[PDB]
């Protein structure tokens, strides 16, 4: 299992940050439409203006992003990127039943949600300030590419290198999640502007959908923070 | 570090089961009244008809018990065991300050709560379907006895044998918790009919109480589920 750690230095810019770290052992898919349906209903919820804390939570993330030098309009947190696409098109496209499910959670609860193949990790995830020498494997023009984060940028990383740039802006390719992964790691990331009871409810939507999708699936969820 | 595991097959009879697993390293008891006050106030709360989800949760647990062959009228879950006694007898007898506090959590939040001496475990706890050959050290009319669970009975067990029969109906003698224990394991077991934010609230009542009773105590909390 994966035991994430957060550098105490992050309290300088994001005091009161809290996240659910959820380790999953998957099972064969038996209800493949779970993700599609949750996503369709999440898009309507957003179009209907839900949830109530969305603007305050997104604003709080944008303050955080600015605090480590990022331009949030150009490189938004994952929650805002999804919300803007739903409010521009009225819907969002399928990709994979598990990705659709966790994007649906992110939309319904206005909360950044990451999902990764935990078998691809070397060591445990850590949330730290980057020094600019780290490697990040990504896509430049649809093909594999490598780049480095900015000095002082907040990153998730393992022993090899960066696994998510600018806190929750862009996941790397190496640890990308697929519905056929035998071992998954999700991180649902929040600031005080989101009520902690709603974070618990987002995690409960996620694990319920995963279990309906894959009967026999098991999870371990831990509240972490700085 | 007790690392409980649960069998994938439990999803077939208790889809959406989730339990808060709390590992505790005790400290000296500086305020032994913590358990006694919590239990009195919890009995009062049950008399007033709290909490809202009690009926639905106990009903769902009875559904799960019948699904593996038990007679909940003869062998209720531990939460209804306590609730029935308070409603029938107006109060509940003190036993031990740590036992009193965790029974109070069960009463106030209408959730089965197990408390055990983790130093008495041989290996790690596991939640499995019994095959009927395991052994279980219990009491018959006050006097020590050995039983075996039914084939298909859901049990908590360790390397030696059963530590709780019929999921959360009756703990064994071997791993009974006492206030003087140096290492303690609590399991607060819930079904979807209990709102998950109230399960976290129950956990916080328990760890806030333990921290007041034993300043300097350490704990780690993990939500596990199927």
């Amino acid at each position: 299992s994966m035991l994430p750690s957060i550098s105490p230095e992050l309290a300088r810019i994001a005091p009161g940050f809290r996240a659910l770290s959820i380790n999953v052992i998957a099972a064969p898919i038996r209800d493949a439409q779970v993700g599609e349906i949750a996503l369709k209903e999440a898009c309507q919820a957003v179009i209907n203006g839900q949830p109530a804390w969305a603007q305050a939570h997104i604003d709080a993330w944008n303050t955080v992003l600015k605090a480590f030098g990022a331009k949030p309009k150009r490189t938004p947190c994952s929650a805002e990127a999804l919300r803007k696409r739903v409010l521009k098109d009225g819907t969002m496209a399928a990709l994979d039943p598990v990705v659709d499910l966790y994007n649906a959670v992110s939309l319904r609860y206005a909360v950044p949600v990451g999902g990764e193949n935990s078998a691809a990790y070397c060591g445990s995830p850590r949330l730290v300030f980057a020094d600019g020498s780290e490697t990040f494997d990504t896509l430049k023009e649809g093909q594999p590419a490598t780049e480095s984060p900015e000095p002082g940028e907040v990153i998730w990383r393992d022993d090899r290198g960066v696994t998510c740039r600018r806190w929750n802006w862009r996941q790397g390719v190496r640890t990308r999640l697929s519905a056929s992964d035998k071992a998954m790691w999700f991180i649902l990331e929040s600031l005080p502007e989101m009520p902690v009871d709603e974070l618990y409810a987002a995690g409960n939507m996620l694990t319920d959908g995963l279990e309906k999708m894959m009967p026999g699936l098991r999870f371990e969820s831990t509240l972490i923070g700085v």
Side-chain angles (χ1 to χ4, degrees), chain A residues 71-190:
Chain A
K71 302 177 183 182
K73 191 164 107 71
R74 296 288 175 266
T75 59
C77 76
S78 67
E80 190 177 18
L82 294 172
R83 196 172 178 82
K84 288 182 145 194
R85 191 147 53 222
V86 172
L87 300 180
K88 174 60 175 49
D89 307 331
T91 194
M92 272 209 38
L95 304 137
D96 166 297
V98 175
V99 172
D100 294 348
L101 177 52
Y102 75 72
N103 286 337
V105 173
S106 176
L107 283 157
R108 179 170 286 274
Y109 288 93
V111 56
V113 179
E116 292 175 69
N117 172 15
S118 50
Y121 260 74
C122 173
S124 276
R126 43 200 191 104
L127 181 70
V128 301
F129 284 109
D131 71 23
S133 70
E134 303 88 344
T135 63
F136 180 58
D137 52 281
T138 187
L139 297 177
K140 166 202 52 174
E141 190 63 19
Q143 296 291 114
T146 307
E147 63 178 18
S148 291
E150 303 292 339
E153 168 183 325
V154 168
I155 54 167
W156 280 102
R157 65 157 302 163
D158 67 353
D159 292 347
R160 284 181 70 171
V162 177
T163 62
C164 193
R165 277 197 66 189
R166 297 189 172 102
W167 201 319
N168 45 50
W169 159 67
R170 182 174 289 169
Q171 296 287 328
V173 168
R174 173 165 62 85
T175 63
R176 70 200 185 279
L177 184 156
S178 167
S180 62
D181 293 337
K182 293 170 72 181
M184 307 170 183
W185 178 65
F186 302 90
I187 190 83
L188 300 79
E189 299 180 293
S190 73

Side-chain angles (χ1 to χ4, degrees), chain A residues 15-16 18 52-61 190-196:
Chain A
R18 36 168 157 87
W53 61 87
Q55 189 62 48
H57 199 204
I58 291 173
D59 280 352
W61 275 106
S190 73
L191 292 173
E193 289 72 14
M194 183 189 191
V196 74

